[PDB]
Scaffold this motif. Structure first.
Motif, mmCIF file in Angstrom:
data_model
loop_
_atom_site.group_PDB
_atom_site.id
_atom_site.type_symbol
_atom_site.label_atom_id
_atom_site.label_comp_id
_atom_site.label_asym_id
_atom_site.label_seq_id
_atom_site.Cartn_x
_atom_site.Cartn_y
_atom_site.Cartn_z
ATOM 1 N N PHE A 18 52.058 -31.959 32.803
ATOM 2 C CA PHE A 18 51.090 -31.073 33.444
ATOM 3 C C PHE A 18 50.978 -31.310 34.937
ATOM 4 O O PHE A 18 51.057 -30.378 35.734
ATOM 5 N N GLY A 59 51.047 -22.006 30.411
ATOM 6 C CA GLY A 59 50.290 -21.190 29.480
ATOM 7 C C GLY A 59 49.755 -19.877 30.024
ATOM 8 O O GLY A 59 49.275 -19.037 29.254
ATOM 9 N N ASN A 80 50.783 -16.503 28.658
ATOM 10 C CA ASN A 80 50.314 -16.129 27.335
ATOM 11 C C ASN A 80 49.327 -14.969 27.390
ATOM 12 O O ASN A 80 49.373 -14.068 26.554
ATOM 13 N N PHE A 94 42.384 -16.077 23.627
ATOM 14 C CA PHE A 94 43.452 -16.726 24.378
ATOM 15 C C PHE A 94 42.977 -17.294 25.713
ATOM 16 O O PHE A 94 43.426 -18.366 26.130
ATOM 17 N N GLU A 139 40.711 -20.610 25.153
ATOM 18 C CA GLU A 139 41.523 -21.771 24.823
ATOM 19 C C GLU A 139 42.310 -22.225 26.056
ATOM 20 O O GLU A 139 42.497 -23.422 26.284
ATOM 21 N N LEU A 140 42.760 -21.259 26.857
ATOM 22 C CA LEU A 140 43.515 -21.556 28.057
ATOM 23 C C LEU A 140 42.641 -22.284 29.057
ATOM 24 O O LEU A 140 43.084 -23.214 29.720
ATOM 25 N N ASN A 157 41.751 -25.906 27.683
ATOM 26 C CA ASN A 157 42.818 -26.876 27.865
ATOM 27 C C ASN A 157 42.948 -27.394 29.297
ATOM 28 O O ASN A 157 43.277 -28.558 29.512
ATOM 29 N N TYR A 158 42.694 -26.542 30.278
ATOM 30 C CA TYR A 158 42.770 -26.979 31.667
ATOM 31 C C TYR A 158 41.607 -27.902 31.981
ATOM 32 O O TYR A 158 41.708 -28.771 32.834
ATOM 33 N N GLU A 191 42.606 -31.302 30.888
ATOM 34 C CA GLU A 191 43.498 -31.937 31.835
ATOM 35 C C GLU A 191 42.713 -32.619 32.948
ATOM 36 O O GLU A 191 43.092 -33.684 33.442
HETATM 37 O O1 LIG Z 1 50.867 -23.390 26.087
HETATM 38 C C1 LIG Z 1 50.095 -22.888 25.246
HETATM 39 O O2 LIG Z 1 50.435 -22.525 24.094
HETATM 40 C C2 LIG Z 1 48.619 -22.729 25.624
HETATM 41 C C3 LIG Z 1 47.870 -21.716 25.049
HETATM 42 C C4 LIG Z 1 46.542 -21.515 25.434
HETATM 43 C C5 LIG Z 1 45.976 -22.334 26.398
HETATM 44 C C6 LIG Z 1 46.740 -23.358 26.980
HETATM 45 C C7 LIG Z 1 48.057 -23.551 26.599
HETATM 46 N N1 LIG Z 1 48.786 -24.576 27.063
HETATM 47 C C8 LIG Z 1 48.402 -25.447 27.990
HETATM 48 C C9 LIG Z 1 47.158 -25.380 28.623
HETATM 49 C C10 LIG Z 1 46.795 -26.336 29.552
HETATM 50 C C11 LIG Z 1 47.659 -27.380 29.866
HETATM 51 C C12 LIG Z 1 48.893 -27.459 29.237
HETATM 52 C C13 LIG Z 1 49.849 -28.625 29.530
HETATM 53 F F1 LIG Z 1 49.206 -29.586 30.193
HETATM 54 F F2 LIG Z 1 50.326 -29.129 28.391
HETATM 55 F F3 LIG Z 1 50.862 -28.184 30.275
HETATM 56 C C14 LIG Z 1 49.261 -26.483 28.299
#
Ligand SMILES: O=C(O)c1ccccc1Nc1cccc(C(F)(F)F)c1
Ligand SMILES: C[C@]12CCC(=O)C[C@@H]1CC[C@@H]1[C@@H]2CC[C@]2(C)[C@@H](O)CC[C@@H]12
Length: 248
Positions: A3, A54, A57, A156, A159-160, A163-164, A167
């Protein structure tokens, strides 16, 4: 980790505004340069985003929507970073060929707004923000503003964004020792990110009005900048599109 490499690898480079410093300062010239800089800075943001993990997506429509709603917050935040790392927040470093000083801040007919920006720029220092923290926060700003009625595929996007945010935690949990400061550092950054929205909204209002009477003040507005500020922006000032605050 992976990342982090990406973010640091897809970070836009220096971008000039193309301002002719040989001509004396004038509202028209200054704002016209900022608009041109915006158009230029927007091209990098588009590519920067598409290369974001991501991001590909989200529905193509939501990809352009989120970009047309938070372009102001991103550029301001980034600009605040350059000002801190280049002139130690002494002046607003919009571009190498367009640095704003006390005078220009007055000539721009937006001194108050600049103050808040030079304030955000100083926060990077007062809080001692690290490059890793900066990059992670900027990306999160891309997912900080959406329409009240959600996007094409809200699931979507949530969740995106989720996930950030994770991080950011890991970045924060990679230099601490005890929770006393850990869970605390999160509070500081979340606050900094939120302080960006207010500033961004003030600029939104300003660019809008400026666009309305752009011909009377002889201020040029690039094609793209003109469409977004008249179609996208209005939805924000009308309440249709609201930012996402962490705190109330
Ligand atoms: O890559 C997907 O499938 C994803 C889908 C939804 C939200 C986030 C997604 N991936 C994602 C989101 C944040 C950080 C990272 C990673 F750090 F792995 F790159 C990957
Ligand atoms: C986003 C930009 C340009 C990119 C940047 O570094 C931040 C800066 C903040 C003020 C904006 C400017 C673009 C042009 C605008 C929108 C003017 O019309 C009024 C406010 C200006």
């Amino acid at each position: 980790p992976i990342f982090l490499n990406v973010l640091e690898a897809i970070e836009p480079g220096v971008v000039c505004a193309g301002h002719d410093n040989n001509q004396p300062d004038s509202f028209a010239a200054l704002l016209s340069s900022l608009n041109e800089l915006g158009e230029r800075q927007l091209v990098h943001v588009v590519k920067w985003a598409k290369a974001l993990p991501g991001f590909r997506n989200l529905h193509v429509d939501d990809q352009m929507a989120v970009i047309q709603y938070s372009w102001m917050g991103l550029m301001v935040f980034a600009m605040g970073w350059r000002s801190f790392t280049n002139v130690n927040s002494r002046m607003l470093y919009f571009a190498p060929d367009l640095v704003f000083n006390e005078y220009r801040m007055h000539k721009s007919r937006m001194y108050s707004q600049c103050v808040r920006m030079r304030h955000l720029s100083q926060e990077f220092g007062w809080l001692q923000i690290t490059p890793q923290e900066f990059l992670c926060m900027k990306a999160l700003l891309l997912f900080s503003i959406i329409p009240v009625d959600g996007l094409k595929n809200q699931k979507f996007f949530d969740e995106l964004r989720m996930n950030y945010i994770k991080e950011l935690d890991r970045i924060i949990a990679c230099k601490r020792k005890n929770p006393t400061s850990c869970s605390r550092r999160f509070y500081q950054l979340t606050k900094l990110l939120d302080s960006v929205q207010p500033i961004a909204r003030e600029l939104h209002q300003f660019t809008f009005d400026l666009l309305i009477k752009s011909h009377m003040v002889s201020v040029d507005f690039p094609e793209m900048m003109a469409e977004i500020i008249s179609v996208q922006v209005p939805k924000i000032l009308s309440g249709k599109v609201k930012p996402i605050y962490f705190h109330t």
